[PDB]
């Protein structure tokens, strides 16, 4: 515990779990009325 203790402030990749794998650019790559608009309806 913290009491039994016998410093001084005054002085890429994406995780794939199911076991962990890292997905990054080393293994993933890219190949290739008023006007109606997307938004809230209330």
């Amino acid at each position: 515990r913290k009491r039994n203790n016998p410093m001084n402030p005054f002085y890429h990749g994406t995780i794939r779990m199911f076991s962990l794998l890292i997905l990054s650019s080393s293994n993933c790559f890219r190949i290739g009325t008023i006007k109606n608009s997307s938004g809230p309806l209330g």
């Binding site: 515990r1 913290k2 009491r3 203790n5 001084n8 402030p9 005054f10």
Partner: protein, 104 residues
């Protein structure tokens, strides 16, 4: 990080506390804990209100690389289960009130 340590660790700070709240809490009838330049490793397995009138304390939670700066005249409520590290660089004296569930 972006969020200050007080919000992350849920520490109530009432800096420059007025006399009304102090007399409502009955701080004047609490005991006095004194210390000089020391370092107390403590885990708050219970809530504790602390009023600092003389001295300064820098609080470092377990593992944190930052500290919460508390001066004199501030009312601080250390939450339950907090594992911090108390640091003092000067003579220090405070009034306390350990609080159980509910109560105040």
């Amino acid at each position: 990080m972006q969020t200050p340590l007080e919000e992350l660790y849920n520490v109530k700070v009432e800096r420059k506390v007025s006399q009304r709240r102090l007399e409502e809490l009955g701080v004047s009838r609490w005991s006095v804990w004194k210390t000089g330049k020391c370092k107390l490793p403590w885990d708050w397995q219970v809530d504790q209100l602390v009023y600092i009138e003389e001295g300064e304390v820098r609080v470092v939670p377990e593992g944190s690389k930052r500290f919460m700066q508390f001066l004199a005249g501030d009312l601080v409520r250390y939450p339950k289960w907090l594992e911090a590290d108390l640091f003092f660089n000067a003579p220090y004296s405070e009034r306390y009130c350990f609080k159980a569930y509910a109560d105040d």
